Amino acid sequence: TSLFTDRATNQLYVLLSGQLHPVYNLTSARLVLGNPANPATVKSSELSKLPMGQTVGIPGAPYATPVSAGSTSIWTLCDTVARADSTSPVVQTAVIAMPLEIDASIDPLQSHEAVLVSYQGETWIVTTKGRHAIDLTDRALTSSMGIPVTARPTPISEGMFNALPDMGPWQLPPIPAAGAPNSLGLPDDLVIGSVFQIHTDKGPQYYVVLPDGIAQVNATTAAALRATQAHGLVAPPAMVPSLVVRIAERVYPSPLPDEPLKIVSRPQDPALCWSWQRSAGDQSPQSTVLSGRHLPISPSAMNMGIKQIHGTATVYLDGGKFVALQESMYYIDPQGVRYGVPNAETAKSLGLSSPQNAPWEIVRLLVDGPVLSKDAALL
Ligand SMILES: [Ca+2]
Ligand SMILES: [Cl-]
Ligand SMILES: [Cl-]
């Protein structure tokens, strides 16, 4: 045995080379000894019975490295804004590494739901997939998808912004010779960029006039094109169906959804989350955007939130964790701070086994502690 605890001082001592050394923590001792040792309680007596050297180890290291994990690796990042009905709204970021309790009051965004969000002056709209760049001032766009003028975008965190994958602008695709006469044989009314309609089995189908033909557009896209430029058309003129059957049908790639979009009320649903989970059984991970009244955890789990020394998030753990990121390894202590574990042997010396896959998009947000290395724990 080369690891001792003075029953009075509770200070850890580790025999190396040939003499005793005071060591900061159990982590640093197992690092220098090379094995996940356990301390042997000794009275103050036998300490003095042998020479002493300088203090050794890592001060910023956790005392030990316990782990309480799945089964399943689940990591969820959430943004909560209080005073959402102000000027002046304040964002609270939370990192959750425990089982999630998802319900109707906090679940993934529906296809027809979206959250208006502002980051670094610009605004972004968040869907089920991720975020889209959207022109806040574009009233012809926003009123076309039925975005309320009362609807205020709410600040998002750097963490949540980086977590949410970009899905492209939003924003209409441009039309070159918009205003110029059409080269399709259509009436002079329908210059390119203009919209007409044809009544079908399902009622009106809308078409925008393009340089190389016509293109089916949804009502949201149709109402948008007219809103930005109506070309003197009060309403999309009715065209008899047979008149267009021999006009080349093209593709106008508008991101605007067929559905009217419910823009969630931040006072009602203050929680915006990016959840990540892998079953630890082959396959790929699954991620989605959550929206609702509160964090997707049990009410009593709120007592486990620890605000870091100087980090950006409040962490929620049901125990220490050991993970593998994009492949770099980090141990997470019960206080939610990450420590780099350089290699497998170093991990084995800590008694750490089997890293679970975790997303860097969330683990990054933890306070990065000192690297737990063999060379470091020697001083
Ligand atoms: Ca919902
Ligand atoms: Cl987990
Ligand atoms: Cl896994």
Please describe what this structure looks like.
- A seven-stranded mixed beta sheet has the order 7-18-17-5-6-20-19. Strands 8, 9, 10, 11, 12 and 16 form a six-stranded mixed beta sheet that branches. It has a four-stranded mixed beta sheet with strand order 3-2-1-4.
- The longest helix is centred in the middle third of the chain and has 10 residues, at 219-228.
- The chain has helices at 26-33, 44-48, 139-142, 158-163, 219-228, 344-350, 360-363, and strands at 3-6, 12-16, 19-23, 40-42, 73-82, 90-97, 106-108, 113-119, 122-126, 131-133, 154-155, 166-169, 195-200, 203-210, 213-217, 262-263, 271-278, 286-292, 305-307, 314-317, 321-324, 329-332, 338-340, 356-357.
- The radius of gyration is 30 Å and the shape is elongated.
- It has 379 residues and is mainly β.
- It has three domains: 1-64 and 372-379, Type VII secretion system EccB, repeat 1 domain (TTHA1013/TTHA0281-like, 2-Layer Sandwich), CATH 3.30.2390; 65-171 and 255-371, no CATH class; 172-254, OB fold (Dihydrolipoamide Acetyltransferase, E2P) (Beta Barrel), CATH 2.40.50.
- 12% of the residues lie in helices and 30% in strands.
- The structure holds calcium ion and chloride ion (2 copies).
- Calcium ion binds at residues 107, 291-292.
- Its EC number is 3.6.-.-.
- Residues 319-372 are annotated as: Structural repeat C2/4.
- This is ESX-1 secretion system ATPase EccB1.
